[PDB]
Amino acid sequence: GAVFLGFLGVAGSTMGAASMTLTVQARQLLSGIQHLLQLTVWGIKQLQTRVLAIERYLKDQQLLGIWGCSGKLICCTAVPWNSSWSNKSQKEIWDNMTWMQWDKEISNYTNTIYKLLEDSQNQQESNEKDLLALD
Amino acid sequence: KKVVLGKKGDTVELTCTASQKKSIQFHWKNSNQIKILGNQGSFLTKGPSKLNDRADSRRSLWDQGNFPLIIKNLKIEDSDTYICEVEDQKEEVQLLVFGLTANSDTHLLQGQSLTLTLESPPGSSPSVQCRSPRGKNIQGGKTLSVSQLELQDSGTWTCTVLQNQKKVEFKIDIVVL
């Protein structure tokens, strides 16, 4: 995906391609089985990138936290979809609109989904207490 | 099995194969495994044998994985199986070298006789097919002789000996006066 990250697919490959290259990125990195006096500064600048990679990585890989699947690579949410948002089915979805040209179709619900998602997380917290109010 | 032959005065070539083509460790060792010639990495261990004075090899070829072994100025005792054990197999050449001469040394006369002697190494059952400038196909074993030796017999004689599927040519020089 051109960088240490974006590592769950290749551009132009439509959705299903990237979605499945998830597991093969896993399975491919699972087993593991001249230098100038001022190369210093290149190494240096080389450093940041990797850190920042992990940093952002977490930074929302973290805040998949309030989204209920931090750390991992694959959510499934619990919200009712609004056909007003995309109105498409997996067939054309995964095989077409090579994502970069996919999400622009929904460039606006970008935060409405975060809305509904954290909302259902709080929904779960509410039902956990409802269920615990007796035992 | 793959033999070689010599002429008691010649050299000879003996072959060693290698698939990595890389100059890996080979050693040349005779029947009961004395060390004769050995690749020790990038080096040749002139083994402790009868051949501490003679044997050799084209050295460049090793970085190709073809390791040779020569026996210069063969005498009948250098006649023995060898072995090359490059990585996991022990290719065996077998060298049965001999030589030959005639009885007459400098002086012959017309109507006289001459005989032959072939100095084979032990364990050999050869057959000497011998020639003449006059077409005297002396057909027999070791000791080839003829009761007729003439001025027309002048010129050397292409003598040959078959030791287990090969031969090698020979002078029998004939000079008068």
Binding site: - | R59, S60, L61, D63, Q64
Partner: protein, 33 residues
């Protein structure tokens, strides 16, 4: 093969380390005999 690695490190070291005036090294390219 750590030992081979040290080996090749050393061979790397030796040549800018040591300067052969005129090195007569051999070569052949495959042409069967």
């Amino acid at each position: 093969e750590m030992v081979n690695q040290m080996h090749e490190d050393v061979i790397s070291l030796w040549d800018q380390s040591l300067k052969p005036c005129v090195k007569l090294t051999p070569l052949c390219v495959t042409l069967e005999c």
